[PDB]
Scaffold this active site. Structure first.
Site, PDB file in Angstrom:
ATOM      1  N   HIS A   1      16.447  47.874   2.380  1.00  0.00           N
ATOM      2  CA  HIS A   1      16.120  47.260   3.748  1.00  0.00           C
ATOM      3  C   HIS A   1      14.873  47.227   3.970  1.00  0.00           C
ATOM      4  CE1 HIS A   1      20.000  47.382   6.464  1.00  0.00           C
ATOM      5  NE2 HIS A   1      20.713  47.635   5.215  1.00  0.00           N
TER       6      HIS A   1
ATOM      7  N   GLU B   1      21.378  40.288   4.132  1.00  0.00           N
ATOM      8  CA  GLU B   1      21.492  40.208   5.558  1.00  0.00           C
ATOM      9  C   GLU B   1      20.181  39.403   6.266  1.00  0.00           C
ATOM     10  OE1 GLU B   1      22.141  43.761   4.751  1.00  0.00           O
ATOM     11  OE2 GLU B   1      24.019  42.480   3.945  1.00  0.00           O
TER      12      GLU B   1
END
Ligand code: CL
Ligand code: CL
Ligand code: CL
Ligand code: CL
Lengths: 338, 338, 339, 337, 337, 339
Positions: B38, B107
């Site tokens: 992330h 994402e």
């Protein structure tokens, strides 16, 4: 006062596992810091390696107490977007507080060309580097930031994993203009070996830049990376430099050359004379000591030594025994940290 | 025989804490780690996002665990596929037999920072398939070139390359991509879901592998599950609400850009929304039965993410009461170079 | 002191355009004087189930009623619609139906704009696009040959030959304090959604301050609000109607990046009655609808557009016509969105 | 049996006037309307260009006429093809059986305002063919995606969709595109031209339809003609010169950007240049014979544009003396669902 | 049938001097000229780079020599392929039977000035092949269009077109492109190299020609060589070091951008590096044997570049002692229409 | 002053070999200068030619002592990047010192459209031309230069083959604005034939531009290109203009029209009346003389005459005998040449 010297970990030449073991040994032998290049390709096939430095730095951090830095990363959006470099730097400093310094530079085609984009001239890449610095510094505030400039766009972004104090940003350059800008905008300078006059000019430019921005340059790192060849005989030291580091004898701009095979073919022109002032080639460890001491005397506060031969273990032990204990550093010299 | 995977939640925990907890997990009988890649957490309350590639170096050097990214998007937003290939090759070269490269379509939460057009899921799948082609070319260890719809690679070679490449694992919940994963890659990683959905994904993966002449019984089928263990049921529920409200969001999340967006959406989440998505109980027998059921469906590895901040206590509880009682098939394939 | 009136919101997300046309004709008979029509390509959810092309429908409305009408709102920022096309469309409607059209514009939502497959900027950037679009529309509304080159739009030599004597007003639809101030500075009036009193006062205040700082008189500028209500025979039916038909009304979070009706549909499963507090008035009590609207007038809104979220449009229109509209008290010289 | 199409000239007339005249045309026996989709007039003297889509809503709601765009360019300058699809679907949903979607490759006069590269005609044909693909996908009423050379459509669905889509009619004077129209679309619209050119276009259209397994005898073949009627021949000639000099420009006009450009070119136009392009006469028998000849060639609908400002008088004259005497084949297909 | 080609070095010499020397070369028995198309010299010490196309007009009008570009890159950096086609057609129209169009994949030294992405060699080959397609279409003398990966040509025609097009000659040292040259073009130009490399290129060219149904024995096979003649061996060596250090750089040079870059690299070059790349001697018999050997390998034309500034003396020396003693096969094909 | 006049070499109409021979004859007959258009296509197929001017200019330079210039080249990055035009100009001036002048302009689609790129409106192409001038002037310093602007990018570049004094940059325009900019930024003006009022305005604007930049306009060339038709009879002269140069009777902007076939079809509308004031059509050489003298009297320092007929040899001899000797030029009038 205390013994110290930097070790250059040559990713172009050595498997990352070997570099890890040798850095551990270097620590035992009195080296206190590591410089690791951020490459995708070696200069030549004969060098034959190029590990992903960011992964390796995690291993180094977790198994030693050495300081370490990238020497250098190009955060100008070819291999690496500046936001990613910022996150990586912040993570290393968060994991290993007081130990990491972020060395950045304008990059070389050898590594950046793989993504198949327009490669700007040096002066333009300097402008890209300056914008990248702006991005990294915004992210290092630890707040939500946005950025839109000529080269980079950053949508709402925040580094949530952020040390209390950011790692220093060190610029690697041999250009007078960028040296001044480094003093103005960043925390310290890294430069290659060169003659006394060129080194004094770079130091002077860096100092002038820092002073004009209200900073005290005596507290800011001034670092140099040098290439040497030590071996049991002078002849072996010369042969090692020719075979392993012919790029060291290429006194010309190398930032546009794309392929290891290109450097390989150019290497056929290189001869021992071309290493004068660029690679010290001798078995005489007293002469290594005098060369390094002279750089300290010019005002460099850290030196990172790259031995070009494959005899890394023997080099490390030789420097640990005969060189590092005799170097005289100013007691209040700033190091790249915190 | 006894084993289980630990999910290291970069969204929630400082990398130093994760390193210490993975070391403990190894002592307590976990054999593998899954680490998310992330840039941002889902919410500010989670509050972290370390650069996983640096951390994996530290994990590799201080444990004997297997480990993988769960997952990296190599589709040219944060990361160019050539860089992911180099990173994967370096980790496997340093830690042979231990790394698996988990990849996915990504994402917006992480990828939007670079300020580019964000394609629909079906288009990102096409990008992922092209990225796989790039990574696999580089994994041959030869000089390669590539020109496709999404990526361009000029003459490039991974000089630092293990003898055998790390496995490529695709993280997906889509039947189409599951089939493509069997055809093109080495193994599957999927999230928790009902029995019918899980059987469909397994079936698609197996059919894809068989049609490409591979033996799917030797290929990993991995699942990542989210649980909440605590001393009481009430604490387990409260932990899930506070720490992982995204777990109660039964809707596509790949277009949502900001932690602040998820934070505002979280205000709608209630305990009922975690049914089938986060198991919330103090009863360790019930944790054991939930995991065993997944093994019985045909999963060969399970990575468990405990959503509470009580990681140390969770690890010890699972080590004592859960891991020893899980029954794995004798020759079940694990994600490792084969 | 002023004559009876109220605006009707024609919900393109929910209703077939033929039904909307018939209901607007009825609304006129029942005392509504104005129509607000959204410019969508997609509904929020499949259960809503519609999305007519508003520009064609407005022609039908114009030709069969004497109602005023406006877009609530169009995004003229170059995804579905280039600003020059919006300008031409607005000019044509005002030329055909003088004194009746107002051009409501806004920064748009991915739900509608994503179909063209282009980079979707963050809200702050889309505001900048909106401001440039306003510049383009205003240039074209001079009725001369104009050119434009800015960051976002390029217009080659262009002129609106079919141009009313007086342009339709440009109204910005926003719920943001910053854009409300900019609306006062740059445009002719404000349109905002229903919200609590504190938020509405802040938006009005920002709009007024923006107008005054640009040397304008905000007392002569329209301040419009679109409210979502649920009227039905019982309170329980009104609540159920809001849940089923307008769950987006209970989503107190930014919605401008969500691309698909199916996405909102899945998010809707989390919405509960409590989430409509301050966003959708749900009651059968028509006195309470009347008091709610009167309060908005008293805050300083000069026009109100009412969207009843239930499918009982005809019954709603007749109920409001009988019990609500005749009792509303408008200031005599309140500015309305018109040339 | 009696019928004829009226061309509503957006280049020349205020939309309110066009609305009133179409209502009159219906009373006088016209059964259909063709409306151009312009942003600019050819000349300042023409002086108008309403947004056709808004006006069509007014026409639909106040008449029972059939109507169509003649034509819209859905090739991504002024209009993305997805928007044209939505607009067409809305009109057909509101006015079932009445709308036909006429499309074409467009002119710089209208498209240049967005400041983009203007391709040559053959390339714009390729863009038109891709646009047709997009419109037809959306007309299925399902969620569709599209990625081609010219257009991208993310997940999109027309929720407001009639049971049966409006026909797609292509407006072209090119043999190649006429064949493609037969293959891919529902009917053809072409301008007035000599017999040989018209026969070639009809033949190409028919061949295209047959090769795709369609029956071209059931497909509309439509023509738009320009005429000048007035009380005297001299007035009819003067009207054409002043109002429609573009009618006497026998050269490709698709690259010319500005009304001021056509205005300057108009100074060269003389009566002789209208031969075979604009019929200019007060003799209504001669109007009748001209139209009948086109029916006899095989056209199933004719849209007449009178170039003079005397629209009301033209409409009444045609209603009295022309439309009742036209002889249409009994089962001729018209542009309709 | 005594003959030899003269290389006019634009990198080194003012165009006025080159013009005078080519006129002298004609008097002394040279029959053809090769002129490089540069924007920059390799080094500042070379110090020139005239626009070759203008100069070729002067050469054509004041001599009867054959001449060609050696070579132009028509791949859209400095030059769009349509412009190269027009230029070639004009020269051949003005000087029929005299011009040959030499083309190649280009060098950054010249092309980088326009500030665009510089592809790898293999990609530039693909660009060159597409450029050849464009040039050949234009050489038909008809209206043509083109759309490929790299180039777009809207309706274009060369109205000034000789009856027979000039031959297209490709300059390459790559086996793959040599084969493609035989297949697609009219002849080959290659630099000096060892016997094995030259035979491979000739062989590839021949195979390419034969597979396309052509007779390679009728197609030019040309070589450009670099020599240094002077009054002493020592002067010849010194001339090569100072004037042409790039000749001693046995490595790919196509990515290097600046004269200053070559200048710095030149500091590494020594006499040994010119072995097999620049013949450096005062002995004109040895020049003769070197050239004769290349004829014997199967080259049908040789272009000689003397690297020293003593061009006049070189030309007279070759005219007296070298050119009369060269033995060419009787029916050897030369680069001409 | 001594006898002189410019000859226009029409690349649209004539084979380059014929133009070369006729320029050599023109020199013998008293013409002192040549203007050569830089086209890729003729206006019409009936004209039927378009040589590459840069190659031809080399031949002209080497076989005559005439001055010569491009009338004009567009250095705005369609057919030609400005750096290439600079190099070409520098080479010609280096080879033929004192003889070349670089005429530049905003270009026409007829020639530029072949590369398949966006064709800007005239005002935008002016901005491109101004940036191109900046590039050419940087390169004309003879140093290593870089450039980055809106339209052009130049990496480190130097003209090593550079005359001691650069050739003059002459701008071809009929616009008052660009005429002023030409005086400010360049060395001289070239304009087409037009009425007295327009010509005076252009001269005045050019002079004002020069003076405001501290330059002396009395030393700067003011040049005009005119089209005429001489033949044995007036009727033949008219017929020649109709057949050979119908574009001369097209009083409308022609810069957007792409194809020779387009002009060919437009030509069918052109009649003798349309050439009034644009092409002088007469056999009377006294009338040619008066027309040219009038332009000198307005303040033009050079005139380039294009005879539109195919009778070039006869035209050249007629002008040499009956026109050129009788023209009266001011004694020290500046001509387009390096100074
Ligand atoms: Cl080095
Ligand atoms: Cl989850
Ligand atoms: Cl709402
Ligand atoms: Cl003219």
């Amino acid at each position: 006062g205390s013994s110290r010297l930097g070790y250059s970990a040559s990713f172009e030449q050595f498997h990352p596992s070997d570099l890890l073991r040798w850095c551990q040994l270097a620590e035992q032998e009195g080296f206190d810091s590591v410089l690791a290049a951020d490459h995708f390709h070696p200069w030549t096939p004969e060098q034959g390696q190029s590990g992903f430095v960011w992964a390796w730095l995690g291993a180094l951090g977790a198994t030693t107490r050495l300081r370490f830095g990238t020497g250098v990363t190009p955060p100008i959006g070819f291999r690496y977007h500046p936001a990613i470099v910022a996150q990586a730097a912040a993570t290393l400093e968060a994991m290993f507080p007081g130990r990491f310094w972020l060395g950045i530079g304008a990059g070389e085609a050898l590594n950046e060309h793989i993504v198949g984009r327009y490669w700007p001239e040096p002066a333009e890449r300097i402008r890209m580097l300056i914008e990248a610095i702006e991005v990294i510094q915004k992210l290092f505030t630890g707040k939500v930031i946005r950025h839109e400039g000529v080269y980079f766009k950053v949508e709402s972004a925040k580094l949530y994993t952020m040390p209390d104090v950011p790692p220093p940003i060190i610029v690697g350059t041999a250009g007078p203009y960028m040296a001044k800008k480094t003093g103005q905008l960043c925390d310290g300078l890294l430069t290659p070996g060169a003659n006394d006059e060129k080194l004094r000019l770079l130091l002077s430019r860096f100092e002038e830049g820092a002073r004009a921005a209200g900073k005290d340059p005596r507290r800011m790192p001034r670092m140099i990376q040098v290439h040497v060849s030590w071996a049991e005989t002078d002849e072996q030291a010369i042969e090692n430099a020719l075979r392993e580091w012919p790029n060291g004898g290429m006194a010309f701009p190398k930032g546009d050359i794309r392929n290891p095979e290109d450097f390989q073919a150019m290497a056929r022109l290189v001869r021992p004379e071309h290493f004068q002032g660029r690679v010290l080639m001798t078995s005489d460890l007293d002469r290594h000591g005098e060369f390094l001491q002279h750089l300290i005397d010019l005002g460099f506060t850290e030196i990172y030594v790259h031995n070009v031969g494959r005899n890394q273990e023997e080099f490390i032990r030789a420097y640990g025994r005969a060189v590092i204990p005799h170097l005289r550093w100013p007691a209040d010299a700033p190091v790249a940290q915190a």
